[PDB]
């Protein structure tokens, strides 16, 4: 029952260069038909906020509401297809409003409009 | 400012991968916006594979071997997408037409649950 908007812990390693690696939270951005039936999911990496900057492909999430070590940001320029086996525990899920912010950042990141 | 633009098809090394993720050295199409393609250390791409049966998959976009010089008739998989460091990009094979890129945008929207 993996759903779009869920935040899972996942192992992104190994990676190269400026790709985001390590074991970190990721948010599921794949549509729910694929999340239901497919061997893979598509995710965006989350990282620990390290400076207040306005980046159109970034979406901030608060440490408290969602249960997080820190105030974090979702990087919609770091996205990948993972085998579902990579998904460890499910940490949380994002609100509808937050997912709207995410959809937006995603559109920007992928050069899509509407 | 790298000449990397959205729609370009590059050869790239996806390996190593796990399970059903697409690995290997294959063609990929650049789906990132062109500001990021210009300035950023990474690009976002969708994997291309050889077409192994004609099937109607909403997240798949077929591309002909002739118009894009290609070993085979191929399909772009919009459910297999990832951010690569630009160093992973080998030679630039080709670029896709505007119409084809529209098909891609649509498949992408479907794949990511956007409308």
Author numbering:
A (entry chain A): 1 to 114
B (entry chain B): -1 to 113
List sentences from the manuscript.
TA modules are small operons encoding two proteins: a ‘toxin’ that interferes with basic cellular metabolism, usually translation or transcription, and an ‘antitoxin’ that neutralizes the toxin and protects the cell from its potentially destructive activity (for reviews see 1–4). The toxin MazF is activated under a number of stressful conditions via proteolytic degradation of its neutralizing antitoxin MazE by the ClpPA or Lon proteases, (18,30,35) and was proposed to be under control of quorum sensing. In this paper, we present a method to obtain large quantities of active SaMazF and provide the structure of this protein as determined by nuclear magnetic resonance (NMR) and X-ray crystallography. The SaMazF dimer is formed by pairing strand S6 from two monomers to form a dimer-wide 10-strand anti-parallel β-sheet.
Three different crystal forms of SaMazF are available, which lead to the structures of 14 crystallographically independent SaMazF monomers forming 7 independent dimers. Each of these monomers was independently refined except for the eight monomers present in crystal form III, which were restrained by NCS because of the lower resolution (excluding two more variable loops that clearly adopt distinct conformations). Overall, the structures of the SaMazF monomers are very similar with pair-wise backbone root-mean-square deviations (RMSDs) of 0.18–0.58 Å for all 99 residues defined in each molecule (the 8 NCS restrained monomers from crystal form III are represented in this comparison by chain A only). Loop S4-S5 (Ile61-Lys70) is involved in lattice contacts in most but not all SaMazF monomers. Four classes of conformations are observed. The most common conformation is observed in ten chains, two cases of which do not involve lattice contacts. In the remaining four chains, this conformation is prohibited as it would lead to steric clashes with a neighboring monomer. Of these remaining chains, form II chains A and B adopt the same conformation while form III chains D and E each adopt a unique conformation. Loops S4-S5 of the latter four chains are all involved in lattice contacts. Thus, it seems like loop S4-S5 will adopt a default conformation when the crystal environment allows for it, but will adapt its conformation otherwise.
